[PDB]
Design an enzyme around this catalytic site. Structure first.
Site, PDB file in Angstrom:
ATOM      1  CG  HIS A 282      -1.861  -1.181   1.191  1.00 37.45           C
ATOM      2  ND1 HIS A 282      -2.934  -1.405   0.187  1.00 37.45           N
ATOM      3  CD2 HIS A 282      -1.824  -2.190   2.328  1.00 37.45           C
ATOM      4  CE1 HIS A 282      -3.186  -2.598   0.632  1.00 37.45           C
ATOM      5  NE2 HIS A 282      -2.748  -2.930   1.870  1.00 37.45           N
TER       6      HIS A 282
ATOM      7  CG  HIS B   7      -4.720  -6.262   7.325  1.00 39.56           C
ATOM      8  ND1 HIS B   7      -4.200  -7.006   6.543  1.00 39.56           N
ATOM      9  CD2 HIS B   7      -4.649  -7.075   8.509  1.00 39.56           C
ATOM     10  CE1 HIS B   7      -3.739  -8.179   6.882  1.00 39.56           C
ATOM     11  NE2 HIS B   7      -4.262  -8.043   8.178  1.00 39.56           N
ATOM     12  CG  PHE B   8      -5.821   0.342   2.535  1.00 42.35           C
ATOM     13  CD1 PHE B   8      -5.141   1.498   2.880  1.00 42.35           C
ATOM     14  CD2 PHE B   8      -6.838   0.559   1.605  1.00 42.35           C
ATOM     15  CE1 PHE B   8      -5.789   2.831   2.501  1.00 42.35           C
ATOM     16  CE2 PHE B   8      -7.542   1.575   1.400  1.00 42.35           C
ATOM     17  CZ  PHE B   8      -6.844   2.834   1.683  1.00 42.35           C
ATOM     18  CG  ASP B   9     -11.826  -2.115   6.544  1.00 45.00           C
ATOM     19  OD1 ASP B   9     -11.696  -3.415   6.600  1.00 45.00           O
ATOM     20  OD2 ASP B   9     -12.692  -1.570   6.690  1.00 45.00           O
TER      21      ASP B   9
ATOM     22  CE  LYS C 175      -4.481  -7.022  -1.824  1.00 52.44           C
ATOM     23  NZ  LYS C 175      -3.672  -6.162  -1.098  1.00 52.44           N
TER      24      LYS C 175
END
Ligand SMILES: [Cs+]
Length: 125
Positions: free
Chosen positions: A13, A120-122, A42
């Protein structure tokens, strides 16, 4: 060397190298260069064009629920330059193709054990 969750978050990210998506081909290049098309295409992934420090600081901002129901997510107080990457129809593993969408939105990240390290990227809103 083991890839820590911190390192993985940066690989998937972080792109402080650019201020915004350079072109419509941005995602195709970045998804490939960051090893995000190796084990599969992905489906969706976001890159943030801000300093690691500003993203890390999000862990001490607005607490919110994660999409999965966990309670360790945090939304940024201010908007940030980001680039949304989504697999398109012409895409087909191992030949992945993506749609690039540049924008300025608030980001939401999950910080491990409700600590201060984003892992994590929500989402972006
Ligand atoms: Cs926290």
């Amino acid at each position: 060397m083991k890839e820590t969750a911190a390192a993985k978050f940066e690989r998937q990210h972080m792109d402080s190298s650019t201020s915004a998506a350079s072109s419509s081909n941005y995602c195709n290049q970045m998804m490939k260069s960051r090893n995000l098309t190796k084990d599969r295409c992905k489906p969706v992934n976001t890159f943030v064009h801000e300093s690691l420090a500003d993203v890390q600081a999000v862990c001490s901002q607005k607490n919110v629920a994660c999409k999965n129901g966990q309670t360790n997510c945090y939304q940024s107080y201010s908007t940030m330059s980001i680039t949304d990457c989504r697999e398109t129809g012409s895409s087909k593993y191992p030949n992945c193709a993506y749609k690039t969408t540049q924008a300025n939105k608030h980001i939401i990240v999950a910080c491990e054990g409700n600590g201060y390290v984003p892992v994590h990227f929500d989402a972006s809103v």
